[PDB]
């Protein structure tokens, strides 16, 4: 099999009767990764993300049998406080890279000023301390430091943008690569779209809405706004989630608030939702134990 991480690529000889937990543990041991609960192995079926089941046969999955057979090692779940919950430099680094990619690809909205500060920590992490003798005008010119949306919002040239980033970069002197990547994560985790799984749903009337699923609970959004939910259901505020046919129903732990019901058509998606729900709830509770 071919295992693709954010920064690296592995090749593995897999035994035909091995299970997800075997291949996962193999990748985890190879990386030196002891906090395994955040991660998973991803392939996508028909435009939909899917994850490798631990207790099921590897080749039983819908993954393309055509060689090489390819899975992406990625964080499935996100901590509530990155600095507090990510102990190993390896786990931190994995999150840093994946999150930074989400932000650059505009999977996670970041506003312009924050995006410049984020870019500056990424530069600190890669190049170490700012050195005007080492780093002169044009030194970032081939890097992609900013979302295109931020760049397009202004008339600024690459050197104008380099100047804004370098101005911030200069002030980070003294922070080690891991500390810089963690400062990046502290900012990114406060972004509103950070760590949220979005799914198109519809309510009883048939109004198209968005279901978010994250570490803190469940959220309903107007399709146009992914930043602020119209409704939130914190994990410790919900009695049960129910699924049958194409429908979900959310029953609040307080009987005096209406249950929320919605329709989700695609079946593969619905499993993902339940998976994500169970996973996120589990992690929510264990932080509070």
């Amino acid at each position: 099999v071919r295992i693709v991480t954010m920064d690296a690529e592995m090749e593995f000889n897999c035994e035909m009767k091995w299970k997800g937990k075997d291949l996962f543990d193999l990748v985890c041991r190879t990386l030196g990764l002891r906090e395994t609960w955040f991660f998973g192995l991803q392939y996508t079926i028909k435009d939909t993300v899917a994850w490798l089941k631990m207790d099921k046969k590897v080749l039983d999955h819908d993954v393309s049998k055509e060689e090489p057979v390819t899975f992406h090692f990625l964080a499935k779940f996100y901590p509530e406080n990155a600095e507090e919950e990510l102990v190993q430099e390896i786990t931190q680094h994995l999150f840093f890279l994946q999150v930074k990619k989400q932000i650059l690809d505009e999977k996670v909205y970041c506003p312009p000023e924050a995006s410049v500060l984020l870019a500056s920590y990424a530069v600190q992490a890669k190049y170490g301390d700012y050195d005007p003798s080492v780093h002169k005008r044009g030194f970032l010119a081939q890097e992609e430091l900013l979302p295109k949306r931020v760049i397009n919002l202004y008339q600024m040239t690459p050197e104008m943008w380099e100047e804004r980033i370098t101005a911030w970069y200069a002030e980070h002197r003294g922070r080690a690569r891991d500390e810089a990547e963690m400062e990046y994560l502290k900012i990114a985790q406060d972004l509103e779209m950070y760590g949220v799984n979005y799914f198109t749903i519809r309510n009883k009337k048939g109004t198209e809405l968005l279901l978010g699923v994250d570490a803190l609970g469940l959220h309903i959004y107007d399709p146009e706004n992914r930043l602020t939910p119209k409704i939130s259901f914190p994990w410790n505020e919900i009695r049960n989630i129910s699924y049958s046919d194409k429908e979900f129903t959310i029953k609040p732990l307080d009987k005096k608030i209406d249950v929320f019901k919605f329709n989700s058509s695609k079946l593969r998606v619905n499993k993902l939702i339940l998976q994500l729900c169970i996973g996120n709830h589990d992690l929510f509770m264990r932080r509070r134990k």
């Binding site: 009695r239 049960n240 989630i241 732990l253 339940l274």
Partner: peptide, 11 residues
């Protein structure tokens, strides 16, 4: 499409 329920918490 199997029926699923998640019971969260104890109450």
């Amino acid at each position: 499409d199997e029926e699923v329920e998640l019971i969260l918490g104890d109450t």
